[PDB]
Amino acid sequence: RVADMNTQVTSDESMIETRCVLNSHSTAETTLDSFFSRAGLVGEIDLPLEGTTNPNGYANWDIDITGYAQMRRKVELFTYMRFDAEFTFVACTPTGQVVPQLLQYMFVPPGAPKPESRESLAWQTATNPSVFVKLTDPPAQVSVPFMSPASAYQWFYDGYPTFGEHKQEKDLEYGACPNNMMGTFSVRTVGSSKSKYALVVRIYMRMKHVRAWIPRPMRNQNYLFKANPNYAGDSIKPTGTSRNAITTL
């Protein structure tokens, strides 16, 4: 009772005279599954003998692929980005030597206990996905699914995770979407005593079944901090090279 509830004989045609061109040019190499399914360095883990970085033989690497400029700029072409990842860990000595050392990679999802020591009880990995591999073995390759609570990963989060007043002490929470932090990637030398080899674990990550949504401008400034679009303000460089004059090349 309411009723209100391939060139042929701007497509090259309107500008010049054209011949017929049979364009047998495949577009399959410009897809996301072609542009992004290439493993790039997203993490390097140092396990030295005398250094103060990870002196106890264990390390907790927070999963943040924005630590290296190449893959960060590749994935940051978009905001929303849903994919499965092929994670490869190339463990080696800092001199490149392949030493007979056994390591334990362990995926520690958010909420799972980060190991506080090399001999921590979190290394029993009764539920956590963990990889046991020697350095003499080929690099450990694992298929990582799309694990975000969101429908896509989000390299740019214009907002704050929590409510309440956002002071300068809580300003670091800006842009930190917890749909993207997926816990830590924990590495140890499997043993009670300290490993006799300095070790470097290089994480190489290849994304498969890639879906990306919203293209943004690329990164024309030097990256400074992970998960942060901060740029050197006093040294802003142009997007490309310059010219002495505009009438010349």
Ligand X SMILES: CCCCCCCCCCCCC/C=C/[C@H](O)[C@H](N)CO
> Using CB under 6 A as the criterion, which residues of the chain lie in contact with ligand X when the complex forms?
63-66, 85, 87, 105, 107, 129, 131, 142, 144, 153, 155, 180-182, 185, 227
Smallest distance, a second copy to C-beta of residue 122, A: 10
Smallest distance, a second copy to C-beta of residue 71, A: 29
Please give the angle made by the CA atoms of 56, 185 and 223, to the nearest 5 degrees.
100
Q: Is the dihedral of CA 113, 149, 147, 178 positive or negative?
A: negative
Query: In the complex with ligand X, which residue's Cβ is closer, 51 or 149?
Result: 149
Query: In the complex with ligand X, which residue's Cβ is closer, 65 or 210?
Result: 65
Whole-Å CA distances, 179 to 20, 81, 147, 172: 50, 12, 9, 16
Q: Which does 88 bind (CB under 5 to 8 A by kind): ligand X, a second copy, none?
A: none
Q: Which does 85 bind (CB under 5 to 8 A by kind): ligand X, a second copy, none?
A: ligand X
- Burial-class residue 181 by CB neighbours within 10 Å (0-12, 13-18, 19+): middle
Report how far residue 134's alpha carbon sits from residue 98's, in angstroms, rounded to the nearest whole number.
9
Smallest distance, a second copy to C-beta of residue 154, A: 21
Q: Which does 93 bind (CB under 5 to 8 A by kind): ligand X, a second copy, none?
A: none
43 contacts 67 by C-beta, under 8 angstroms? yes
89 contacts 131 by C-beta, under 8 angstroms? yes
Which positions touch a second copy (CB under 8 A)? 2-5, 18-20, 35, 38-42, 123-130
Smallest distance, a second copy to C-beta of residue 2, A: 6
